[PDB]
């Protein structure tokens, strides 16, 4: 994602030609070095994708505010380095989580939409949009469960706010994850 941003079709093509080169190397190992079980080009890449997705998740879960901030935030004064207790989870509000929901959506979209087509060489094995949705939800759901448990001890947001969050989460799961 960082090395071949979707915003550069040229680096998406160099990316495509890179995976064509990596198939060409796997094929050299298989054919010229005559190796019997060289690293399979789809699994090699799937690791790299999982890697890039997990780096994405870590970075979003730690920097939710800076990211949601700059990428969408409904108040320009809230785009910057909001406190770490609001770039990761807040006990005061549910807004970090509404923000994290939108981050997750956006990434799964870019993966589904720019990268799944760029990286079609193993289409059967490598739906970048699905690998994205799974990885990101998994990492999310853990974090969200602990958050809701934490809110429950403090009850600083109103009942209503958690009901609103429930409809958003209900929607999100029932969209991407289910």
């Amino acid at each position: 994602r960082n090395n071949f941003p979707a915003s550069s079709p040229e680096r998406l093509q160099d990316l495509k030609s890179t995976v064509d080169l990596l198939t060409s190397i796997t094929f050299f190992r298989m054919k010229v070095q005559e190796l019997q079980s060289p690293p399979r080009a789809s699994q090699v890449v799937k690791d790299c994708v999982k890697a890039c997705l997990n780096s994405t998740y870590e970075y979003i879960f730690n920097n939710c505010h800076e990211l949601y901030g700059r990428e969408y935030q409904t108040d320009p004064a809230k785009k910057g380095e909001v406190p770490p207790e609001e770039q990761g989870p807040s006990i005061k509000n549910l807004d970090f989580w509404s923000k994290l929901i939108t981050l997750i959506v956006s990434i799964i979209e870019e993966d589904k939409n720019s990268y799944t087509p760029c990286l079609n060489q193993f289409p059967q094995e490598l739906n970048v949009g699905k690998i994205s949705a799974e990885v990101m939800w998994s990492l999310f759901a853990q974090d969200m469960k602990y958050a809701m448990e934490e809110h429950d001890k403090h009850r600083l947001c109103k009942s209503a706010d958690y009901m609103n969050l429930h409809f958003k989460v209900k929607w999100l799961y029932n969209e991407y994850v289910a």
Partner: protein, 88 residues
Amino acid sequence: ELQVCVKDYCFAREDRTVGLAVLQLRELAQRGSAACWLPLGRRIHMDDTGLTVLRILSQRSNDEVAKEFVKLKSDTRSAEEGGAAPAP
């Protein structure tokens, strides 16, 4: 059988397996209810047939039950903070 796993909760990182214990529900079929202190291991201990069934189930690498079974038996303590390999 119950498989009881202790894990360290780790946002940003990964939730490290601290240890694993197996309880056979054959025992409970007599006991009805049991208080027990399960000692935790680093990996589950196996015979040739467990290891044969496991290598067979791992070839069913699209069956979700097999995947989760294989994954679950193949869970071991992420070694660190107190050690890697157990005894059987």
